[PDB]
Paper text:
IMPDH catalyzes the NAD+-dependent conversion of inosine 5’-monophosphate (IMP) to xanthosine 5’-monophosphate (XMP), the first of the two step biosynthesis of guanosine 5’-monophosphate (GMP). Inosine 5’-monophosphate dehydrogenase (IMPDH) lies at a key intersection of the purine biosynthesis pathway and represents an extremely attractive target since it controls flux of the guanine nucleotide pool. We have overcome this major limitation by designing a variant that lacks the non-catalytic CBS subdomain (MtbIMPDH2ΔCBS), greatly improving solubility without impacting enzyme catalytic properties.
The apo structure contains four polypeptide chains in the asymmetric unit (rmsds for Cα atoms of chain A versus other three are from 0.10 to 0.12 Å). A phosphate ion originating from the crystallization buffer binds in the phosphate site of IMP, anchored by hydrogen bonding interactions with the backbone nitrogen atoms of S339, G376, G397 and S398 and the side chains of S339 and Y421. Interactions with the hypoxanthine moiety of IMP, E458, and AB-subsite are especially important for high affinity and selectivity. It is important to note that while the active site flap is partially disordered in all MtbIMPDH2ΔCBS structures, different conformations of the flap are observed in the apo structure and the structures of the complexes.
Residue numbers in the entry: 27 to 127, 253 to 431, 452 to 528
The structure:
């Protein structure tokens, strides 16, 4: 436990120190890898390996069929959002399936209606069902995962989330999950940690979930909080097998929504699925906000920047594969270390394709 005395007589009350992406850097190591020779393939689930270890979020401002098609063509996968009627979601799965036999996932909730939705998605040819919940360590979520796996698990892979602890990941593994999705609160548009006061910083959440999942051979999906290509490398080094992205993809041409023009600039709508506008869950109050992000152009170019940065990280850490990157070491840093990591003491005059102010 956290050794430092911070009050009371119970040393387990404050149980650990949580780190997130900006708290760590990957240490370079001996290398015979250059970005060109790195292999970025990685398991999405026990049975499915992607060429690029990225998936798009199941949000109504990120992933519909156009995004799912573009993600699969880029070597990743999209998870179709579930904020729409069951027949429309199933229709979108079909749209993706008839664009080349591309991989696709789709989100479902828990309960009878979610069950009907799942069954329809499976009939439509979905490859991955994602049981998409705020708190997967609730007994009802574990049941849903276990039952889908029992009924359709031969035909479809079943992902469960979200979790932020070792015990929750362990419960999902025991329920038969084919992958575990980690992230309680880190999302750019999420307010769970603020309105409920609940969560775990994302690097520690990954390390803890992986401590349960890795020995069981179950891939971890790092969901939320990623803003730069280097964050993907950190998530994967912490032990995740793939990263799920919302904000980084919401600004692309393929994300749903029309372009927003404000003050000579271009934006796209991006909102939490727990935001008032989205709910319109078991929630009594919202756990997200509604906002906008800058327009970033074609998905393909964004993914090229992200995989290029990941490949650089693999070259620096001497990792020929994602499986080796998962063994890399971190150094913890201070606020000055973070300031030093970004550009500092200079005015940027030109935008970089992989770095914005
Ligand atoms: K947040
Ligand atoms: K720097």
């Amino acid at each position: 436990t956290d050794p430092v005395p911070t009050g009371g007589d119970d040393p387990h009350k404050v149980a650990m120190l949580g780190l997130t992406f900006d708290d760590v850097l990957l240490l370079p190591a001996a290398s015979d890898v250059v970005p060109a020779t790195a292999d970025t393939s990685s398991q999405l689930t026990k049975k499915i390996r992607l060429k690029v270890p990225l998936v798009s979020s199941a949000m109504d401002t990120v992933t519909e069929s156009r995004m799912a098609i573009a993600m699969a063509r880029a070597g990743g996968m999209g998870v179709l959002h579930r904020n729409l009627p069951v027949a429309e979601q199933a229709g979108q799965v079909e749209m993706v399936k008839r664009s080349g036999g591309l991989l696709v996932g789709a989100a479902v909730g828990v309960g009878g209606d979610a069950w009907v939705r799942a069954m329809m998605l499976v009939d439509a040819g979905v490859d991955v069902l994602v049981v998409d919940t705020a708190h997967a360590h609730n007994r009802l979520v574990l049941d849903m995962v276990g039952k889908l796996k029992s009924e359709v698990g031969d035909r479809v892979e079943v992902v469960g989330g979200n979790v932020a602890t070792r015990s929750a990941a362990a419960a999902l593994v025991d329920a038969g999950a084919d992958a575990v999705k980690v992230g309680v609160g880190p999302g750019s548009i999420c307010t769970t940690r603020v309105v409920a006061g609940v969560g775990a910083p994302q690097i520690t959440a990954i390390l803890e979930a992986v401590a349960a999942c890795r020995p069981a051979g179950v891939p971890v999906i790092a969901d939320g909080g990623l803003q730069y290509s280097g964050d993907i490398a950190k998530a994967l080094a912490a032990g995740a097998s793939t990263a799920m992205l919302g904000s980084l993809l919401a600004g692309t041409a393929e994300a749903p929504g029309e372009l927003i023009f404000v003050n000579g600039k271009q934006y796209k709508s991006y909102r939490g699925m727990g935001s008032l506008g989205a709910m319109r869950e078991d929630k009594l109050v919202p756990e997200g906000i509604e906002g906008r992000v800058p327009f970033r152009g074609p998905l393909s170019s964004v993914i090229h920047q992200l995989t290029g940065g990941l490949r650089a990280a693999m070259g620096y850490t001497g990792s020929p594969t994602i499986e080796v990157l998962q063994q890399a070491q971190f150094v913890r840093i201070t606020p000055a270390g973070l300031k030093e990591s970004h550009p500092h003491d200079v005015a940027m005059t030109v935008e970089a394709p992989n770095y914005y102010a």
